[PDB]
Structures are given as structure tokens and as C-alpha cells.
């Protein structure tokens, strides 16, 4: 945690590799929202992708 904290607006599943599933009503760790479409996350265990339109930067 620490830096940009995001919240989960829906509960997402992941469909390839490099991506990474997050439940509606979470406070993740945002590792990179330089992308446009796809925002990198910290979630429980490991890193990953997931929609940056499924996500709210909370600043």
C-alpha cells in the first residue's frame, strides 16, 4: 500500500495472463495507470492488470 489507493467500482474477473481478479468495495494499491485501458494493481498476494475503467483513483 502506501501510494495511490484505487477503488474497485465493479468486481472483476480475470480473462488472460497478465491479468489479476478484484471484488467490488476494495482499496487496492495502484502500481501503474499510465495506459490508458489497463491499470496495473496490487491485490492479496500478487500484482497484475485489470480495466482502468473498473477503477476510481482515490486521491
Known amino acids: 500500500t502506501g501510494k495511490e489507493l484505487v477503488l474497485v467500482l465493479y468486481d472483476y474477473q480475470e ?5 489479476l ?3 467490488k468495495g476494495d482499496i487496492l494499491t495502484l502500481l501503474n ?10 491485490v492479496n ?13 482515490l486521491d
Open 15 to 19: 480473462k488472460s495472463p497478465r491479468e
Open 21 to 23: 481478479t478484484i471484488k
Open 33 to 42: 495507470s499510465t495506459n490508458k485501458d489497463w491499470w496495473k494493481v496490487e
Open 45 to 57: 498476494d500478487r500484482q497484475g492488470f485489470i480495466p482502468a475503467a473498473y477503477l476510481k483513483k
